[PDB]
């Protein structure tokens, strides 16, 4: 009882046409505004890598231009009155070219662009897709852009758009060399004009920035990322804890895979994990899964600058490296454990204990 | 000291220029191809997904003009010596424009333009992004379509394309009406031209597709989607083998819950409580498979809980892997809480000896889900399901909370328990004799993960839990 209908049947008469893929951009702008992202307030998040991005740009051209570096700052205004947010850079900024080319041509990226000349600033440098700008639209009735180069005879630009097939550039001046974006909220979005909210945002996502954060006036970081170079208040930070860690490991490696992490143990029992982050961006808070489970009461940071991240940032892209890094990661702590009971009494047991049940939890696997 | 940049500087000196988005075509096509699924092998799915569309329209338009149907199939072949993985629909197929415009055009969906010109047939098709088709780019170095639209005086056409901004098209002759697509398997992914591979993939996601699918000469789909059925044509035989399919288990459901809505959203559903003592529910759209793991549908204690949900309106992530919440998760999770805390304690009151033994396999899941709820409304509603054993009812059998509500009252003002560690410890206990002779009753916990779930409980039905031990 086979049943096939797949037969070579065909054949091919007059030369082909050749043809050239295009897309409906309208609809991909959309598909990003209610179809990416799991929360829509990532979009701050994407904004302040932008801007991160804008700042990491400046400098390198700075530096690598022998010129004195200026203040590099990322600000955020809530208004909450007039219904909006507004994220500013002292980044590079750009030209109306450069407006046109890099806002308005979707999966554009000028920083991956600016990436393929580059090697110090391409370790930094965060967007890769270009598609990131338009999370905007997720929480946005409306964009209002202003920009100008740092380049010299540079002018001012107001790019704005509604969200839809069509944007308008028109000049205006009074623009300070950087970048500014005021987006005005959707009804349902109205909690972004709130100070507190946007608060909690950043700090969920962009607590690590390498460039001076103001939310309404206020600044932020002062927050070093320890996970690469008082391991105490990291800890009872990233684990949130009135708590302190009874073992620590700085674990950084470039064989097998570039990684950069900091493993803490707890000082209580949990009767009843991880966080993985990219370029200091968030890409998980709780990080499932990198880490074997019999290990879940470890916790604290694992980065990657080498993990092919989702289009979403949301989410490791589980090609299989990433839980062959996950053994890598069980070997070196096996290898911390058993040299941390002989270099103490202690040991990798009774000392501990009300983990040792997580190890024969650890041979239930 | 507070610094701030931001202020309003700027003054408009122009009028604007008006302009087009547009898109890098490229990259997009790689994006969707190296960025957008967690595994290759959904490409299967995704084709067949969009097969199935095929046929759809083609039956909602031949019944619209009153047509007979022709064999309506979805097949699959793996030649391992050529290296291909093929499908082919005999469904309604595409015309040349039709070609250019649905495959040609990223994000273009003629499945849902085909809905946007739509009733009755709408609840079927799968697809509306328009990237799934690219999908065959994440394992093909070339991609062979030909393509036959179901319209009179159709001719056939062959499509082909690498994935790298360029495709072509020519005129074809000996295309059956449909569309054969030929993928060309990339090297180190010949692995999708094994017979078992793929049939594993196309069981995976696609074993409920509503088209008969062979594979290599044999018939997949053999399953029913016994979800969609009324709850009386299904009984005991096909609710054991859907169980035992979905759960991958190998004994009987202790219960069975045959659950249907549109009291929010669309659900049509299946649960199931197994035999076994324990040692995740599937989400379907579409009868297209979105989780193997429906984690967050169900509250985390009712993960005990195997079977399916399907709901052809939940809203999907560009990557249908994952969900995306709107308000409707969090409502429709809420909604089969307590469909189920109500399925569990009715069918407590209708049997309660079976309900019994369901405590003592898996009351622990219910003891947690008190202890972790935020509003106290749901602990109480799980509460209703705690059942112990009390100093008035002789050593072994159970009673409900609500039942000590009702066997304490006019001049008593509270419930309480005493938790230990057996029967004679709790009706020998110091503490208890002192409740029985001011004699208020005092239920009896054995499983003092029932004294910690008491205490975050801290009240139940507009009354405290005050502990005897604590007195
Ligand atoms: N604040 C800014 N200042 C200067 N240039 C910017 C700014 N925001 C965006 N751009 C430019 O416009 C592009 C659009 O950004 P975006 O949509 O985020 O894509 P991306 O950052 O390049 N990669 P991704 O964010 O992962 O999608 C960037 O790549 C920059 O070239
Ligand atoms: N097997 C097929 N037979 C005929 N037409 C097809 C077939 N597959 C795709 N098409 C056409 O190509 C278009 C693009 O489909 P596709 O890129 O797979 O995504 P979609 O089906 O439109 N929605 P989605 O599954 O979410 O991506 C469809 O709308 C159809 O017009
Ligand atoms: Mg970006
Ligand atoms: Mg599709």
Known sequence: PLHSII???????????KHEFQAETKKLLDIVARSLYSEKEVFIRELISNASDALEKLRHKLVSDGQALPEMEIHLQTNAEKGTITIQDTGIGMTQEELVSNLGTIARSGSKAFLDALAEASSKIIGQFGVGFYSAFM??????????????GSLGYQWLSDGSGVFEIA????????????????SDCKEFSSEARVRDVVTKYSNFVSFPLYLNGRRMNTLQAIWMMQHEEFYRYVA????????TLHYKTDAPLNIRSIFYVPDMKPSMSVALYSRKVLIQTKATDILPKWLRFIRGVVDSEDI????????????????KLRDVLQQRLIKFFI?????????YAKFFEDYGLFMREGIVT
């Open 308 to 323: 092919p991240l989702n289009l979403s940032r949301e989410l490791l892209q589980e090609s299989a490296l990433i839980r």
């Open 339 to 347: 040299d941390q009971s002989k270099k103490d009494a202690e040991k």
């Open 240 to 247: 949130q804890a009135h708590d302190k860690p009874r073992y």
């Open 7 to 17: 037969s070579s049947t065909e054949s091919v008469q007059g030369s082909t046409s």
């Open 139 to 152: 929480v946005a009735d409306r964009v209002e852009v202003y920009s100008r180069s740092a380049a010299p």
């Open 171 to 186: 000049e205006a001046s009074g623009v300070r060399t950087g970048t500014k974006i005021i987006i005005h909220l959707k």
